[PDB]
Design a protein around this ligand. Structure first.
Ligand SMILES: CC(=O)N[C@@H]1[C@@H](O)[C@H](O)[C@@H](CO)S[C@@H]1OP(=O)(O)OP(=O)(O)OC[C@H]1O[C@@H](n2ccc(=O)[nH]c2=O)[C@H](O)[C@@H]1O
Lengths: 694, 7
């Protein structure tokens, strides 16, 4: 049993180091010498859990507990395993049982907090992280995770001190080569240096390298020419987000727009089929669709990618939920590039390129990234809005304002032509329906909360009732087949004032940003800021910090999160979008621009803080991009007071969303194609990854 | 309800 104990401690150190195979070997040998050894069962279970052997893991956790019924550790680690298997009920039973055994067990409190957060119970998560910290004040994981909860609800009590402490915690962890407690995806939210952000990522990349080294795969041998593929570049899009996810809402038309003479497209799904048209469309239009969710072993899954012959393997997850970067760590393809889904560097040497653009990622900051920059010529951002919401390409109003009462629809022109007295208005072409028996009936439907009515045989629908009329149109899976009415009164917005919006999750907002917004609102009397309950419990924090800034309550109007098509349709009711500088609207930025709504942004240094400025540059609206906070406020105030200048900027957005590259998925695909071929030349000529700043 | 980018 001291022989056993030294095997176990060695195993623990081998584990901290990342030598997983060897750790396992030793735990087993520990049990081989001392079978009734609870901690070895639990630690073995715990490393098997790292390896994805969830069942075998559970079996050893239960041995541990059988041997020692009060072993709180085993219960807490078993909870994480159950959580990994999506058995939330089982995880909660384990965590609470561990806390019942030892109410001072801080890890157990921290893990209970984490499942509360994931369930969208932030107040309880915060409370349980606080208990963790109370019990163990030096607890990085729990602190940083608390910091993210607070961020999420816009709690900024002791904000600057908190930021300083996150940085310090990360500094320390990076000095000790331990896994930082700030997740790489969250790292743009805090005043970490680009070196810290790059290193955070590098460390999570290293996790993946450690996990694949147990498999002992030799390097794969990679194609040097297009001979086996009949002259076609084989491109593999790897994503867990081929389904109802923002990623598919951005890029679902790209696969089938690829040029099959010169490209052969393979989609590697990491998630199972969710039943949505998004999945249906990519499965139908990619040349080959492979479901790697059915292939849990990453060895065998990388094998497949290699035997499909991929030249460029594309990482659409980075560090997001569903990632299997282990696939990329095995390098089954000679060229591996980050694209679209992850707004950061991977920090990993197994990724060769990040696809991006000059505005998003200027040369100055190329040391922000482990990868070489592969520049698209306009923005790297793209959106499938032209295909998903073509009923928003045109609009009509009722009585002259462009954004109080709005009608959209595929058959809108025909309905207009059915009416006696429609006027057309030249934009600085917008149909206008005069105040009329018909106009009265439409407004009446809205006020009374009616779902739809009929006028001249046309179906006219209440934009608030999309899920009752057609739930697939609500999600963006189908184009609506009725005419939709959308109005400021449906959202409690005033008919007579400037509406600034921002429809992002509240976490992207920070004190400086809300201070800007307040300044702007103060400068523009009778205007409002229109935000979302995302989540709803951030609302009072926001409202309060705004009261402290001088603003009355009625100046900020919260609406609920809506189905995808309503969200997009409703941005039409706003005058201006005030983008979040800390982390811009990305998908959200394309959403609001498709409504014809100008966006004021202030590009920062991070990739996430520059994306909207790149969208806007591609859109051709340089006037909306601020160089500092005074600019940002002046632009926004100007757009709220100089109303002719507001007409002009809105007309420019409205038409540039069609005539500019921004929402042009075909053009984007073709440009993407040129860039892939550049990447391929360079490597086929025997060179290594290098910058492609066209 | 509505799907987003997450870690
Ligand atoms: C910071 C960050 O992670 N950025 C990522 C990008 O870098 C990736 O390129 C994007 C593609 O993977 S996703 C992500 O982009 P973001 O702009 O952060 O949007 P987020 O991730 O919060 O999703 C909100 C969703 O709610 C929808 N939405 C919103 C409001 C509403 O009422 N209804 C609704 O359907 C919206 O249409 C969205 O579909």
């Amino acid at each position: 049993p001291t022989h056993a104990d030294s095997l176990n401690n060695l195993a623990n150190i081998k584990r901290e180091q990342g030598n997983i195979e060897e750790a396992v070997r030793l735990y087993r040998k520990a049990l081989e010498v001392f079978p009734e050894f609870a901690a070895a069962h639990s630690n073995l279970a715990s490393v098997l859990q790292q390896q994805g052997k969830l069942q075998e893991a559970l079996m050893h956790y239960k041995e541990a507990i059988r041997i020692s019924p009060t072993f709180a550790d085993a219960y807490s680690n078993m909870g994480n395993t159950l959580k990994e298997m999506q058995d939330v009920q089982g995880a909660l039973q384990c965590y609470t049982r561990a806390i019942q055994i030892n109410p001072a067990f801080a890890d157990a409190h921290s893990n209970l907090a984490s499942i509360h957060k994931d369930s969208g119970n932030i107040p309880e998560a915060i409370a349980s992280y606080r208990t963790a910290l109370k019990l163990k004040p030096d607890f990085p994981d729990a602190y940083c995770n608390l910091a993210h909860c607070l961020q999420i609800v816009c709690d900024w009590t002791d904000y600057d001190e908190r930021m300083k402490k996150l940085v310090s915690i990360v500094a320390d962890q990076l000095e000790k080569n331990r896994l930082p407690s700030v997740h790489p995806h969250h790292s743009m939210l805090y005043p970490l240096s680009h070196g810290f952000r790059k290193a955070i990522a590098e460390r999570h990349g290293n996790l993946c390298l450690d996990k694949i080294n147990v498999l002992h795969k030799p390097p794969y041998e990679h194609p040097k020419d297009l001979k086996l593929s009949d002259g076609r570049l084989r491109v593999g899009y790897v994503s867990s987000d081929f389904g109802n996810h923002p990623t598919s809402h951005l890029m679902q038309s790209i696969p089938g727009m690829h040029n099959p003479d010169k490209f052969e497209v393979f989609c590697y799904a990491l998630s199972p089929d969710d039943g949505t048209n998004f999945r249906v469309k990519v499965m139908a239009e990619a040349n080959h669709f492979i479901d790697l969710s059915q292939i849990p072993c990453n060895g065998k899954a990388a094998d497949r990618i290699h035997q499909d012959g991929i030249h460029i393997l594309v990482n659409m997850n980075g560090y997001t939920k569903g990632a299997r970067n282990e696939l990329f760590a095995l390098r089954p393809a000679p060229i591996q590039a980050m694209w679209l889904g992850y707004p950061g560097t991977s920090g990993a040497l197994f990724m060769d390129y990040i696809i991006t653009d000059q505005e998003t990622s200027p040369a100055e900051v190329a040391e922000q990234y482990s990868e070489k920059l592969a520049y698209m010529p306009h923005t790297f951002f793209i959106g499938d809005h032209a295909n998903m919401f073509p009923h928003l390409k045109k609009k009509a109003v009722i009585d002259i304002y462009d954004n109080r009462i709005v009608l959209n629809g595929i058959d809108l022109k025909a309905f207009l032509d059915s009416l006696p007295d429609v006027k057309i208005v030249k934009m600085k072409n917008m149909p206008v329906i005069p105040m009329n028996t018909i106009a009265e009936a439409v407004i009446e439907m809205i006020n009374r909360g009616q779902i739809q009515i009929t006028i001249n045989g046309f179906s006219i629908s209440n934009g608030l009732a999309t899920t009752q009329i057609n739930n697939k149109a609500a999600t963006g899976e189908e184009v609506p087949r009725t005419i939709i009415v959308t109005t400021r009164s449906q959202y409690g917005l005033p008919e007579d004032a400037i509406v600034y919006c921002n429809f992002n999750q509240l976490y992207k907002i920070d004190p400086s940003t809300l201070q800007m917004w307040a300044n702007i609102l103060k400068r523009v009397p009778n205007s409002v800021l229109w935000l979302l309950r995302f989540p709803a419990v951030g609302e009072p924090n926001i409202q309060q910090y705004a009261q402290n800034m001088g603003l009355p309550q009625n100046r900020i109007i919260f609406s609920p999160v809506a189905p995808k098509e309503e969200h997009v349709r409703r941005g039409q009711l706003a005058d201006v979008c005030l983008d979040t500088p800390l982390c811009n609207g990305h998908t959200t930025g394309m959403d609001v621009l498709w409504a014809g709504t100008p966006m004021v942004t202030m590009p920062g240094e991070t990739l996430a803080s520059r994306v909207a400025a790149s969208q806007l540059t591609c859109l051709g609206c340089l006037e909306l991009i601020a160089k500092n906070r005074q600019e940002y406020e002046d632009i926004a105030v100007k757009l709220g007071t100089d109303l002719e200048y507001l007409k002009k900027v809105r007309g420019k957005v409205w038409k540039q969303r069609i005539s500019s590259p921004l929402f042009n998925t075909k053009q984007y695909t073709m440009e993407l194609e040129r860039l892939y071929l550049q990447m391929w030349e360079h490597y086929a000529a025997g060179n290594k990854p290098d910058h492609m700043i066209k | 309800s509505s799907r987003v980018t997450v870690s």
